Design a protein around this motif. Structure first.
Motif, PDB file in Angstrom:
ATOM      1  N   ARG A 240       0.843  -1.182   0.000  1.00 31.17           N
ATOM      2  CA  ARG A 240       0.000   0.000   0.000  1.00 31.17           C
ATOM      3  C   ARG A 240       0.888   1.245   0.000  1.00 31.17           C
ATOM      4  NH1 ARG A 240      -3.790   0.209   4.423  1.00 31.17           N
ATOM      5  NH2 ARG A 240      -5.361   1.017   2.902  1.00 31.17           N
ATOM      6  N   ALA A 241       1.853   1.261  -0.909  1.00 31.74           N
ATOM      7  CA  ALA A 241       2.944   2.231  -0.867  1.00 31.74           C
ATOM      8  C   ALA A 241       2.433   3.650  -1.011  1.00 31.74           C
ATOM      9  CB  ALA A 241       3.919   1.897  -1.922  1.00 31.74           C
ATOM     10  N   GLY A 242       1.243   3.844  -1.605  1.00 32.17           N
ATOM     11  CA  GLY A 242       0.696   5.205  -1.704  1.00 32.17           C
ATOM     12  C   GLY A 242       0.481   5.871  -0.372  1.00 32.17           C
ATOM     13  N   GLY A 243       0.321   5.076   0.677  1.00 31.28           N
ATOM     14  CA  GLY A 243       0.076   5.568   2.042  1.00 31.28           C
ATOM     15  C   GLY A 243       1.343   5.922   2.786  1.00 31.28           C
ATOM     16  N   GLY A 244       2.515   5.703   2.233  1.00 29.85           N
ATOM     17  CA  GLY A 244       3.781   6.005   2.906  1.00 29.85           C
ATOM     18  C   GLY A 244       4.292   4.825   3.677  1.00 29.85           C
ATOM     19  N   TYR A 245       5.437   5.009   4.285  1.00 29.83           N
ATOM     20  CA  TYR A 245       6.186   3.866   4.844  1.00 29.83           C
ATOM     21  C   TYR A 245       5.435   3.201   5.988  1.00 29.83           C
ATOM     22  CZ  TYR A 245       7.347   5.502   9.423  1.00 29.83           C
ATOM     23  OH  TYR A 245       7.223   5.818  10.748  1.00 29.83           O
ATOM     24  N   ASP A 246       4.524   3.942   6.627  1.00 32.62           N
ATOM     25  CA  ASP A 246       3.755   3.448   7.814  1.00 32.62           C
ATOM     26  C   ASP A 246       2.321   3.131   7.426  1.00 32.62           C
ATOM     27  OD1 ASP A 246       3.151   6.175   7.543  1.00 32.62           O
ATOM     28  OD2 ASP A 246       3.546   6.723   9.615  1.00 32.62           O
ATOM     29  N   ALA A 247       2.068   2.882   6.157  1.00 33.94           N
ATOM     30  CA  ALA A 247       0.757   2.401   5.675  1.00 33.94           C
ATOM     31  C   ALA A 247       0.494   1.049   6.315  1.00 33.94           C
ATOM     32  CB  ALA A 247       0.679   2.319   4.164  1.00 33.94           C
TER      33      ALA A 247
END
Length: 266
Positions: A240-247
């Motif tokens: 879910r890389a669109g959400g950033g590293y802490d997705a």
């Protein structure tokens, strides 16, 4: 109907990228969705890692005692962090790496394979030996979970990992005695109860190895057996890389992808 369209729907609904590969068999078509796209291994590498250690050594090596200190605990290590005073045998480390995704067990097995500086290269070479020219392991635990999207380090593809797992569990990559040990460790793993296992009916056998990491990464690689004993390999990878590293990684996505696979394999 179109299974790829349903996987795309799952991507939309979870805000995720999904990769699936189920190798073709004498009775079934392949399932392939983003199967040649790269995904981080995360802990899924620990299944082939155990295979590499089994391959390279006689079974007596399972009884070799490995010693380590509290300074060797550098990643999530549910088993190893309780045995700093006793050490753990190689067999125990294999068990812990597959059933508890123990990061220190995996780092110790990498060192057993390649030495302290060569374990990730040795592991990569084991996969080259199975015909896999795409996958690569570059870091040990925990950094292998943490690379940014697009970085090829510590990646595989659903196609490559499914065909590695096919060779390891169903094929002849390992002698049947060693194969049985790998299969039994995977069979006694409950970490994936909410992933591929959750998408297959209870009368199907499922053995698996999960992976979870940054950028919403959740993976599972499994071998499944129908109620009549027909085996399949199922690789499901997601991020879910669109959400950033802490997705947040989403186990349910993998369960639903698995339900769609089970619907066409049933």
């Amino acid at each position: 109907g179109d299974l790829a369209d349903r996987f795309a729907e799952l991507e939309r609904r979870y805000d995720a990228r999904l990769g699936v590969y189920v190798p073709a068999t004498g009775t079934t078509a392949a399932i392939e969705y983003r199967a040649d796209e790269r995904f981080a291994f995360c802990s899924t590498f620990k299944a082939p890692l155990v295979a590499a250690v089994l391959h390279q050594n006689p079974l007596t090596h399972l009884d070799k005692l490995i010693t380590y200190t509290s300074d060797d605990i550098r990643s999530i290590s549910p088993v190893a962090q309780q045995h700093v005073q006793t050490g753990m045998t190689i067999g125990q480390l294999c068990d812990a790496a597959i059933r508890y995704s123990d990061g220190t067990a995996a780092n110790l097995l990498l060192a057993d394979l390649g030495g302290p500086g060569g374990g990730t290269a040795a592991f990569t070479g084991y996969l080259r030996s199975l015909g896999d020219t795409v996958s690569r392991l570059d870091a040990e635990e925990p950094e292998l979970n943490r690379n940014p999207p697009g970085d090829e380090r510590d990646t595989t593809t659903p196609h490559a990992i499914a065909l590695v797992l096919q060779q390891l569990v169903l094929g002849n990559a390992l002698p049947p005695d060693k194969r049985a040990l790998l299969t039994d460790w995977m069979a006694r793993n409950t970490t994936g109860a909410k992933r591929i296992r959750a998408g297959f009916p209870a009368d199907w056998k499922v053995i698996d190895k999960t992976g979870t990491g940054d950028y919403g990464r959740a993976n599972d690689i499994a071998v499944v057996w129908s109620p009549t004993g027909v085996p399949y390999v199922v690789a499901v990878m997601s991020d879910r890389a669109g959400g950033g590293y802490d997705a947040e990684p989403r186990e349910a996505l993998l369960a639903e992808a698995a339900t769609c696979v089970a619907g066409v394999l049933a």
